[PDB]
Amino acid sequence: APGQAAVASAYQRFEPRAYLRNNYAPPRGDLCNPNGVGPWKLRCLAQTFATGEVSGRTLIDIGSGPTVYQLLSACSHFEDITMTDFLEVNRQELGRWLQEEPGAFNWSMYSQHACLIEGKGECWQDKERQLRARVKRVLPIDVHQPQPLGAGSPAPLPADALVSAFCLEAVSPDLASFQRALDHITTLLRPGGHLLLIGALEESWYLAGEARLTVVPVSEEEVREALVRSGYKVRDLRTYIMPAHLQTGVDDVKGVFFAWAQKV
C-alpha cells in the first residue's frame, strides 16, 4: 500500500526522451552487433510468433512507455492491438509515432532488424505501416488496480494475448506487489491465451532524466514461480546476461529475461 504510492510520484519526473536515449540509442540501441540486448529481445519475440502458436484478433501491451519494438513481430498476428501506459507524457510520445508527427522517435533500426530476422522479405516501411494500422487506441493503465484499465474501457476484453516489456518489476516496490500486478494483468487474458513478458533481472534502479526510479531485483527463478502462482504454464523462459560494454551509468540491470507463458 505505502510503496505503490512512492512509485507513482517518482514516475512524475520521468523524461521520455531521456529514457529513449539511455536504452534505445547507441550502445544499447545499436542493433549491428548481434550479441547485443536489442537483437536478443527482437529474436525472442520473433522466434515465439514464428511458431504460429500465438495468435488471435486482440492484443494488449501492458506498460508500453514510449516504445514500439515489442510489437514489431506481434502485429503480423493480431488486428486490434491496444497499447497502454500510466503516464500521459509517454502516450503522447506514442501518439506522435503512431500519427507520424514531427519529433517522433526514429524506430526504423528496429523495424529494419525485425524484418531481417523474420526473414519473410518484408521491407521496413511495410512493417511500420502495418503496426500503425493495427494499433487502434492508446489507453491509460495502472497494473496495481485489480481492474487495470478502468470500469468500462474501450479495450475489447478479454484479450487473446498480453505483451509486457519491463513494466511490472519497474513499477513494484517489492516481490509481493509484483506478484499482485501479475495477478491483475492476468484477469485481462482469455484463458488459454498467451503472455509474452520481458523484464530486467536483478535490477534495483534506473534513470529517466530527472526521475531516479527504484526497482525490485527479480531473478529468473522468482519470475518462473510468479508465473505459475498466477496460473500460467511456462512455455519458455530465457535469460540474457548483460555484457560489460552495455553496462552504462543508466541503471544496474544485470540481465534481461524473456518469458512465454500460457494461461491455464
Ligand X SMILES: Nc1ncnc2c1ncn2[C@@H]1O[C@H](CN(CCCC[C@H]2CNCc3c2ccc(Cl)c3Cl)CC[C@H](N)C(=O)O)[C@@H](O)[C@H]1O
Annotated binding site for octopamine: 203, 251
CB 121 to ligand X: min, Å: 27
DSSP code of 204?
A: -
CB-based contacts of 108, cutoff 8 Å, min separation 6: 124, 128
CB 225 to ligand X: min, Å: 21
CB 243 to ligand X: min, Å: 11
- Return the number of the residue (40 or 205) whose C-beta is nearest its own copies: 40
Amino acid identity of residue 216, one-letter, is: V
The candidate with the shortest Cα–Cα distance to 207, out of 175, 140, 253, 257, is 253
Q: Please give the Cα distance from 100 to 98 (Å, whole number).
A: 6
The residue with its CB nearest to ligand X is 65
Among 35, 102, 120, 152, binds its own copies (CB under 8 A): 35
Per-residue contact string for residues 228-257; x = within reach of its own copies by CB under 8 A: ---------xxxxx-xx---------xx--
The candidate with the shortest Cα–Cα distance to 38, out of 250, 261, 259, 256, is 256
The listed partner (its own copies, ligand X, none) that binds 68, CB under 5 to 8 Å by sort, is none
Beta strands (DSSP E) in the chain are: 58-62, 80-84, 135-139, 159-165, 189-201, 205-208, 211-214, 232-241, 255-263
* Contact set with ligand X (CB under 6 A): 7, 11, 14, 23, 28, 37, 63-65, 67, 70, 85-87, 90, 141-144, 165-167, 170-171, 200, 203, 206, 251, 253, 256
